[PDB]
Amino acid sequence: EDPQLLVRVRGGQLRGIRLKAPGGPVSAFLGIPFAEPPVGSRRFMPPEPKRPWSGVLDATTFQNVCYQYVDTLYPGFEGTEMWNPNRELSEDCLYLNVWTPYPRPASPTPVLIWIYGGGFYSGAASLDVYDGRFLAQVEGAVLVSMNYRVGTFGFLALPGSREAPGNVGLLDQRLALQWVQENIAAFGGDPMSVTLFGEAAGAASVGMHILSLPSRSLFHRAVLQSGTPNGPWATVSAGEARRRATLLARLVGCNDTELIACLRTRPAQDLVDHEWHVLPQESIFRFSFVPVVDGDFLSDTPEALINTGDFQDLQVLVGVVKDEGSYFLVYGVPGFSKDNESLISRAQFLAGVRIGVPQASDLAAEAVVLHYTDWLHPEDPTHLRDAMSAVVGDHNVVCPVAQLAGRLAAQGARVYAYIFEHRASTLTWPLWMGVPHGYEIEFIFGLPLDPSLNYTTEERIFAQRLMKYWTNFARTGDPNDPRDSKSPQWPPYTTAAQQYVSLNLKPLEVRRGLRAQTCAFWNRFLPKLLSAT
Amino acid sequence: EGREDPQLLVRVRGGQLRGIRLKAPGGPVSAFLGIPFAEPPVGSRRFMPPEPKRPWSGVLDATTFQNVCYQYVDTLYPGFEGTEMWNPNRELSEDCLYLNVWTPYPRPASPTPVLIWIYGGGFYSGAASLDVYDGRFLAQVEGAVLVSMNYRVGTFGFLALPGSREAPGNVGLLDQRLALQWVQENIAAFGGDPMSVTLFGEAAGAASVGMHILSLPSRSLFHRAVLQSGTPNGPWATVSAGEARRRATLLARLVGCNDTELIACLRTRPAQDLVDHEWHVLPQESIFRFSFVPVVDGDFLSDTPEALINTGDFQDLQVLVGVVKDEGSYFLVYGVPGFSKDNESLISRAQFLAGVRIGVPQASDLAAEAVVLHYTDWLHPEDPTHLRDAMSAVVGDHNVVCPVAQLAGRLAAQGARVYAYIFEHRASTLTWPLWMGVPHGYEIEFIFGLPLDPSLNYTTEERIFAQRLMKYWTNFARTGDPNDPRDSKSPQWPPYTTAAQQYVSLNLKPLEVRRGLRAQTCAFWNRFLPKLLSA
Numbered sequence A: 001e002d003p004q005l006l007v008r009v010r011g012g013q014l015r016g017i018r019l020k021a022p023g024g025p026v027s028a029f030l031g032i033p034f035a036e037p038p039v040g041s042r043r044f045m046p047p048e049p050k051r052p053w054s055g056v057l058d059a060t061t062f063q064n065v066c067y068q069y070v071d072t073l074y075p076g077f078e079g080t081e082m083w084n085p086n087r088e089l090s091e092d093c094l095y096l097n098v099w100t101p102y103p104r105p106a107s108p109t110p111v112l113i114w115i116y117g118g119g120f121y122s123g124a125a126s127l128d129v130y131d132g133r134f135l136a137q138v139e140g141a142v143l144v145s146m147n148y149r150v151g152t153f154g155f156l157a158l159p160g161s162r163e164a165p166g167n168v169g170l171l172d173q174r175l176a177l178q179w180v181q182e183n184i185a186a187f188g189g190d191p192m193s194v195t196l197f198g199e200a201a202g203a204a205s206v207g208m209h210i211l212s213l214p215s216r217s218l219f220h221r222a223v224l225q226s227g228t229p230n231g232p233w234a235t236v237s238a239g240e241a242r243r244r245a246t247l248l249a250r251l252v253g254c255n256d257t258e259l260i261a262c263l264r265t266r267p268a269q270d271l272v273d274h275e276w277h278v279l280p281q282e283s284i285f286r287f288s289f290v291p292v293v294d295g296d297f298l299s300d301t302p303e304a305l306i307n308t309g310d311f312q313d314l315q316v317l318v319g320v321v322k323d324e325g326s327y328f329l330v331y332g333v334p335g336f337s338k339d340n341e342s343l344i345s346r347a348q349f350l351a352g353v354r355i356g357v358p359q360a361s362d363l364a365a366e367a368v369v370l371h372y373t374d375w376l377h378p379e380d381p382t383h384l385r386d387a388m389s390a391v392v393g394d395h396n397v398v399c400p401v402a403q404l405a406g407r408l409a410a411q412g413a414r415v416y417a418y419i420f421e422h423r424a425s426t427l428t429w430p431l432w433m434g435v436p437h438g439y440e441i442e443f444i445f446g447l448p449l450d451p452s453l454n455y456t457t458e459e460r461i462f463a464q465r466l467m468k469y470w471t472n473f474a475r476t477g478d479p480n481d482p483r484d485s486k487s488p489q490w491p492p493y494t495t496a497a498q499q500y501v502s503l504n505l506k507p508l509e510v511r512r513g514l515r516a517q518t519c520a521f522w523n524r525f526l527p528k529l530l531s532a533t
Numbered sequence B: 001e002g003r004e005d006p007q008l009l010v011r012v013r014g015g016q017l018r019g020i021r022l023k024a025p026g027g028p029v030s031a032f033l034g035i036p037f038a039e040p041p042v043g044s045r046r047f048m049p050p051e052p053k054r055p056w057s058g059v060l061d062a063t064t065f066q067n068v069c070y071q072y073v074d075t076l077y078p079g080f081e082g083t084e085m086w087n088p089n090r091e092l093s094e095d096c097l098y099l100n101v102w103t104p105y106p107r108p109a110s111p112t113p114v115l116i117w118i119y120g121g122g123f124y125s126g127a128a129s130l131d132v133y134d135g136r137f138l139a140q141v142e143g144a145v146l147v148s149m150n151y152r153v154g155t156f157g158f159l160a161l162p163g164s165r166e167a168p169g170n171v172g173l174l175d176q177r178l179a180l181q182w183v184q185e186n187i188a189a190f191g192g193d194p195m196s197v198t199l200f201g202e203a204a205g206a207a208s209v210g211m212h213i214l215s216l217p218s219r220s221l222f223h224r225a226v227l228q229s230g231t232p233n234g235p236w237a238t239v240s241a242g243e244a245r246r247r248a249t250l251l252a253r254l255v256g257c258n259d260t261e262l263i264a265c266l267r268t269r270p271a272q273d274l275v276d277h278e279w280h281v282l283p284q285e286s287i288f289r290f291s292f293v294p295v296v297d298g299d300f301l302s303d304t305p306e307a308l309i310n311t312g313d314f315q316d317l318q319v320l321v322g323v324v325k326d327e328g329s330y331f332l333v334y335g336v337p338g339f340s341k342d343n344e345s346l347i348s349r350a351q352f353l354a355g356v357r358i359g360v361p362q363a364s365d366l367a368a369e370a371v372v373l374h375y376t377d378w379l380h381p382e383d384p385t386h387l388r389d390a391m392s393a394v395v396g397d398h399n400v401v402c403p404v405a406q407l408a409g410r411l412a413a414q415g416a417r418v419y420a421y422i423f424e425h426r427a428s429t430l431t432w433p434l435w436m437g438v439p440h441g442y443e444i445e446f447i448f449g450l451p452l453d454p455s456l457n458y459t460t461e462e463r464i465f466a467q468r469l470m471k472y473w474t475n476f477a478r479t480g481d482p483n484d485p486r487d488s489k490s491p492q493w494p495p496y497t498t499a500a501q502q503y504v505s506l507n508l509k510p511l512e513v514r515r516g517l518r519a520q521t522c523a524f525w526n527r528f529l530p531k532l533l534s535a
């Protein structure tokens, strides 16, 4: 019995497992329950705290993945399968994972809490790219990650109902945050220094905790990688959530109480089978069951909340990858595939814009096409393919990020911004997709430090830099190395200078203006257009 | 005759003329100035098409410039060369339909290609007698026969009650056409070749050239065309029949006046009364807009210039078109609060938004916002230097650059041989402030070769630059190709096409080929704003 692997938390005793990182051992406590299983009558309901347990709970293995849609586009292909569930699916999935140094920290250590993405319809804390051991071992970090409910199970809402009030997957996340405040000190973690970080829907989730008062007492800093609470996909209105839940019920053969009661009888896969059938248009980067503007978790729209919020005591790190949109094009836009160059016609570009900007009117779509066409090369398939990616990336991630960065800065927050421009040497998606959505994560988590994974020496050195920025941010709210001189420093993002950095194999380079002209199109003009028309 | 210079006596259809020997720097040229080409359009003839001049008896003295057509005279900056150089330099009169001819001295012995100049001035002003339109350098140095005519401007040239007999519209264009007919019949008497006539003009003169391209009876009267900083299409060069009628009717009311009865009453008014009220009829507070301009009458213009350039067959056409670096800047001090020639005109964002309503006067609120958003530098949205320069760009692009881009594209797509330039040299002697850059009109003095006159104080490099330009323009006149058929060593000027969109920089440096005439921004003005308009 290794006493470093025995911890007493409020619910009882746990036994962890010693894992081997390249530089040495780490302690892992995996599959720790933070809620009562949300099964049976508890489906669609807020999470309840986990009851205490007898004896020593085995926390040596990852628990089940929350029940979800499994991707089938490219069976056996690593680029898609690396995101698919890697443990059995179950509604009984409300567990979290903690990595710490071995031996455990002698003094209170800054905590990083990871919230995974997956469109609010997928994801798991057990994926290889979210492996917290490198950060634990190399940077001495205490790293936590939780499973939260996704799809109908996490986000189906009949707003105003007792039995399906909405946003319960976010409440799962919050309960895990409360768990950390109550228990993380037992692992050597510092509850007075907690940094949330996440990517895509996970980043949107972090943003929602920034915008919801009860969460604000549970953390001190935030990192939003490639996602935001504002923007076209992260939230729905109460009316649209109700429509979707009501249509789904209809499709599976089902007064809110009666409707929700019948949905609770349905096998989990019956719900998932119809998950994608309730979206209002044919689209990409759109997800059926997402956080809802309920007037409770979210007191108003994220747009409203970011415009009027006071963010003076907040430090935030935000950014994007170079090719945010490319991934999504193979899931809906004719002409696109991983298995060829996806050189498209102008006709295919105009068709794709309707799918990539599915809420756009004819005129708005026309403006998108006119803005993104290179009028020197208006029919060039390479330009048109790359423009399609840009439209989807900018509409869904880059311009929402720019908007958030600007508002948070204007309203007193300390903001740092980046663009991530390095394509992993071992990437299995084609060259044309560039640096796609999701492919900074393996570097931030430090995977290239494992020589068995076949990254280059330069990628290992780059990962070590990134882990340092992130953990320095965790320690101080400033990603710069506190001892260590050398220009260039990473300056805060401001509305005046709009400074951000490129994260690639070259030294930090400071740039100004995050797609400034194009995001003015999306953030200023298109709103004026559809409010008038 | 008997004691006079025998090399200056010429007969035309209306009778005998006596010209004058002028000194150009390289030698003598012949000038026949103030030749009448129409009956004076006075009295009962006001607003009416021109009638051919009746023959005269004896020798007509053609040694001086004739009257300038009655027009508004700029008072913005009294005494200032930058404005006064465009003001009338002879007596204002409605008796003004005269033309000028310059030729080598002695006159050429074999038929010589002819260049015909049509001046600009917003269709409300201008004169063929201005110093910058002096044909002596082209005639002396390039051996050109150069012709320039006065044409009626303002109400006198362009007031229309469409469908009426007494004020049918477009009479200033008909004045131009009659001068072109005069050249066909008479220019051989001077050694000019009626089978090689090239029209060239700037601003409204360029617009006029374009309307001759688009009007059937003009097409037999010339062979090639040059449009400098102006087009027949675009927001200022034409009005609809209904708008012309509205303006004519309002003007009549303002001066105290059934179309016959209305026009009869307008014919009783002093010319100056019409001039004094002509600015009062524009529908908005605006710049780069003019009250009395060509009308889409279904006659001279059978359809809008837009329609005609979209459907026309221009296979037999060769055209040279282009713009200066700062088309808009001039106009800002005539209407946009915050702008002046006597300070740097650094403006606020508020003054930029206000300016956009004045510079894009027909724009709805949404379109104006589209413009502001496009032209704002979102890295420096409040910087007064960028805002000033953006105000200029808005007005230049909207009114000249994007209309030219549109014209060059349609013409090339529909069979024309098109050559395109941007002129980027600022005259060393320019009296307008530096912030205005290379303003509208300030290429002309170089095309006409004024720097060849040492008394004018241009630089040596400016002289060499002028000589190149005159070569380009005259080579184009001669052959439909501005390139020298000898000189393969000099860089070549490629035709503008829709595929490659090539055009050249005209400056002190050897020709540089560039691609795309404001391609992205002109997509906004020419493809997006029109689609917005439809709803």
Ligand SMILES: *[C@@H]1O[C@H](CO[C@@H]2O[C@@H](C)[C@@H](O)[C@@H](O)[C@@H]2O)[C@@H](O)[C@H](O)[C@H]1NC(C)=O
Pocket (backbone or CB within 6 Å): B337, B338, B339, B340, B342, B343, B344, B345, B346
């Ligand atoms: C630039 O000038 C604009 C026009 O005002 C005229 O010129 C200036 C220099 C004054 O002498 C004034 O009396 C004239 O009427 C002004 O609107 C503008 O404010 C001036 N720019 C600045 C701030 O110096």
Ligand SMILES: *[C@@H]1O[C@H](CO)[C@@H](O)[C@H](O)[C@H]1NC(C)=O
Pocket (backbone or CB within 6 Å): B455, B456, B457
């Ligand atoms: C040319 O320069 C001289 C000498 O300074 C000056 O007197 C004359 O007025 C200038 N000529 C012109 C055309 O301005």
Ligand SMILES: CC(=O)SCC[N+](C)(C)C
Pocket (backbone or CB within 6 Å): A078, A081, A082, A127, A128, A129, A424, A426, A427, A442, A447, A453
């Ligand atoms: C199951 C997986 O994560 S695939 C491994 C891809 N990686 C080593 C480049 C992150």
Ligand SMILES: CC(=O)SCC[N+](C)(C)C
Pocket (backbone or CB within 6 Å): A019, A030, A060, A061, A062, A128, A131
């Ligand atoms: C709890 C564990 O260690 S699972 C195996 C994870 N690995 C594939 C990244 C090594």
Ligand SMILES: CC(=O)SCC[N+](C)(C)C
Pocket (backbone or CB within 6 Å): A083, A117, A118, A119, A123, A200, A327, A328, A437, A438
């Ligand atoms: C494209 C998607 O929405 S899922 C892919 C996995 N990821 C989002 C977590 C990176």
Ligand SMILES: CC(=O)SCC[N+](C)(C)C
Pocket (backbone or CB within 6 Å): B081, B084, B085, B131, B132, B429, B430, B445, B450, B456
């Ligand atoms: C009356 C005039 O033309 S003054 C301008 C003279 N300049 C064009 C040679 C500078």
Ligand SMILES: CC(=O)SCC[N+](C)(C)C
Pocket (backbone or CB within 6 Å): B086, B120, B121, B122, B125, B126, B203, B330, B440, B441
């Ligand atoms: C409407 C005007 O711009 S008048 C200025 C003189 N110019 C046009 C002939 C150069």
